[PDB]
Symmetry: C3
Subunit: 157 residues, 3 copies
């Protein structure tokens, strides 16, 4: 018994760095603006896990509206989403995350991202894949306006 | 036992007057959606994910511009026919997940109804269908309000 | 066990045609700029297969440091990735690729892409889906500045 999910997120650059991606603080000349900490990777992953569980999305569980989630970081949101998915009967298959960013270079921070996600999800590191790619100077990411992320997940019952 | 994955992606540009139709739900908006079809970007991407999982190509291959049969059909009809053809290969539904990418309008209040309509079209339980939405934080064509995109993934079982 | 992977790739138009998509040469006013042959569909597919197996991505597997695959075409890269993935004990479930291009027209060329991909992955044609879509003149693909590709893959252990 297996179930698929998909997530996608974008955050627009603003302010100063560091930016936070997959739980890791990365030195960069500007920050990521958000109601939240702007962790596009953990947000997209959270939506994919919630999607596979038919529990909706991050905004559904954690409205900006609701003061209870004020100041929560993305790993806290991920762990809470995961607790609710697990109470629904699911366990982790695997996840795959694709960060879309012209800069900064992601791959030196990626090992650490994988450990944080694997810790947060109670899974083996081998169940977690993160990668990055540019859009070769094209689009809002290529122009350096923001960063995006796509993620997929497989849950088991 | 045998499960199969598919992915769908669709975009339409805003044009004319609202409402827009997303996941079979009429949503009031200042703009409509330009399409030869009803412009239902969610059902179109979902349809391609399902066809994708079944290796049946895509909506364009099933319903060519030049085939009169389905010219003028709404997207739920196309979804229901695509689905008929997928089941004729011996597939049933695992689950689906849809990700609407739109700066506006707000989708979340209409998602419950979209899910009802998809579940009835696919003959499945509500629990096998997820729909979500995200903005692009005012970035890109979606963020500027030029149109709406949608991705979908699907799992089928043989 | 089944595992899921996701890939995404983009190359900008530049130079003269033809471009190569899914191993198939397609005439066009412009080429695709790239260090490699610029086959976005093969690169996205390769990344989806590597992500499923948690082997990272095409840049991790083939760094500029390694002379072995420098100047290698995208089918050679796909086949090497697939060798590394099979060595981890995986075989193919199925793949689905989505080319995102305003132009050129991809439809007539898709049948040979599928044959080439099934050859390279040692699978049946029925395990390979390839489709194309435009973005209706929106965004960087819509204005003919480049071509993007998404892909997903399911592996079995
Ligand atoms: N068109 C849209 C865009 C987003 N949303 C909801 O609002 C939330 C916030 O979206 P952002 O994270 O892109 O700011 C999402 O998690 C989604 O629940 C919506 O309901 N309709
Ligand atoms: N570059 C592209 C884009 C779309 N197409 C085809 O045209 C059909 C309709 O595309 P749109 O919905 O993007 O207008 C699709 O089925 C696809 O097969 C193509 O063959 N090459
Ligand atoms: N922001 C980014 C973008 C790409 N990368 C790495 O660089 C490689 C090449 O990506 P591009 O093809 O977009 O140039 C990738 O395979 C990825 O491993 C990165 O580490 N950080
Ligand atoms: C969901 C998918 C497929 C995401 C990848 C596409 C992407 C990040 C495009 C960026 O610019 P754009 O296409 O909006 O162009 P521009 O901002 O230059 O109009
Ligand atoms: Zn976010
Ligand atoms: Zn459409
Ligand atoms: Zn590439």
């Amino acid at each position: 018994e297996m179930r698929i999910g998909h997530g996608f997120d974008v955050h627009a650059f603003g302010g100063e760095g560091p930016i936070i991606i997959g739980g890791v603080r990365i030195p960069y000349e500007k920050g990521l603006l958000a109601h939240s900490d702007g962790d596009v990777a953990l947000h997209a992953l959270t939506d994919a896990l919630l999607g596979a569980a038919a529990l909706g999305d991050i905004g559904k569980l954690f409205p900006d509206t609701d003061p209870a989630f004020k100041g929560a970081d993305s790993r806290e949101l991920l762990r809470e989403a995961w607790r609710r998915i697990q109470a629904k009967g699911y366990t982790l298959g695997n996840v795959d995350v694709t960060i879309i960013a012209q800069a900064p270079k992601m791959l030196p921070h990626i090992p650490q991202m994988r450990v944080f996600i694997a810790e947060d999800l109670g899974c083996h590191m081998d169940d977690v894949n993160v990668k990055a790619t540019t859009t070769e100077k094209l689009g809002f990411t290529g122009r350096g306006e923001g960063i995006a992320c796509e993620a997929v997940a497989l849950l088991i019952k």
